[PDB]
Amino acid sequence: MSSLPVPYKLPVSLSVGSCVIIKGTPIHSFINDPQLQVDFYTDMDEDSDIAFRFRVHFGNHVVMNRREFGIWMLEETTDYVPFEDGKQFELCIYVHYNEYEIKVNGIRIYGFVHRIPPSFVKMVQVSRDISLTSVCVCN
Amino acid sequence: MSSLPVPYKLPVSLSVGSCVIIKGTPIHSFINDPQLQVDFYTDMDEDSDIAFRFRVHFGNHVVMNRREFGIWMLEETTDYVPFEDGKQFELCIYVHYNEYEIKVNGIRIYGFVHRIPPSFVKMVQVSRDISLTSVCVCN
């Protein structure tokens, strides 16, 4: 059972130096191809532009993109997905001056460069095949 | 030296179940009568109404109040202020359905009952005689 509802839409204010810390557990085993998605939305409205979408295909790869004027830009990917089958994970997204740094269980896996300033992000949505224990926003 | 600037004005969205976790250190010894203040503001504008003001007189007492239509209401106080002279403290404010619960270094010291809904709080300001290490907002 999830501590928070999923999809989880969290109003936020982000600045350089912020960290979003998401703790949860996949609800399906990896042979069932579960996913996790995190969106940095510019408004509560889910059709608003997205500064950074992060979609993990557990045991497979992560696909990242951004949506500008309603148009998806060029996808970025990495095969580095150090999540453990069936276990709680800790996903940290650090807002640096040039990029979002993504850490999985303390392991840096990617840096997604800002194409709009991160202070334009007003909502973080956590969605798909996870039970959500906690979400924190720290400075 | 402070990790964050003081006064620290943090835009927030709070709901029942939120926790504001403030870590920092008094910048004066207790014989010099330092203070710490935390405000739950309804807007970024510091003349907006205040759902909950928390002002610690270290080694002495805490005074709490709220400001409604620009008018300060009746002060509430407790003498329970378990902060240590010269040390880092952890101040947690939990948003429950009926009250803000205030914890100092894990110790519950007070419950300040809501007179407006906590979701009306849009800014948290941390101010006065502290160096601020971190501020987190968790759900």
**SS3 category, B30:** helix
Nearest to B54 by CA among B133, B136, B130: B130
For residue B13, give how far its alpha carbon lies from the nearest alpha carbon of chain A (Å): 6
Which residues in chain B are closer than 8 Å to A138, comparing Cβ atoms? 134-137
* Resolution as reported, in Å: 1.5
Asked if B34 and B20 count as a contact pair (C-beta separation under 8 A), the reply is no
A139/B134 touch (CB, cutoff 8 Å), yes or no: yes
| Residues contacting residue A138 through CB under 8 Å, at least 6 positions apart | A18, A19, A21, B134, B135, B136, B137
Asked if B8 and B116 count as a contact pair (C-beta separation under 8 A), the reply is no
Which residues in chain A are closer than 8 Å to B13, comparing Cβ atoms? 10-12
Q: What is the CA radius of gyration of chain B?
A: 14
For residue B20, give how far its alpha carbon lies from the nearest alpha carbon of chain A (Å): 10
- State the Cα–Cα distance between residues B115 and B56, nearest whole angstrom: 21
B137/A134 touch (CB, cutoff 8 Å), yes or no: no
Asked if A115 and A66 count as a contact pair (C-beta separation under 8 A), the reply is yes
Residues of B contacting chain A (CB within 8 angstroms) = 4, 10-13, 134-139
Residue-number span of the structural domain to which B133 is assigned? 1-139
Number of domains making up chain A: 1
- Kindly list the distances between the CA atom of residue B132 and the CA atoms of A33, A73, A107, B52, B126, in Å, as whole numbers in the listed order: 43, 39, 27, 20, 9
Omega before A5 cis (within 30°)?
no
Residue A59 CB neighbour total at 10 angstroms: 16
> End-to-end distance of chain A based on CA atoms, in angstroms?
29
Residues of A contacting chain B (CB within 8 angstroms) = 4, 10-13, 134-139
Which residues in chain B are closer than 8 Å to A22, comparing Cβ atoms? none
- State the Cα–Cα distance between residues B4 and B7, nearest whole angstrom: 9
CATH number, domain with residue B19: 2.60.120.200
Which residues in chain A are closer than 8 Å to B135, comparing Cβ atoms? 138-139
Of B10, B11, B138, the CB nearest to A136: B138
CB pairs under 8 A between A and B: 28
- State the Cα–Cα distance between residues B81 and B59, nearest whole angstrom: 7
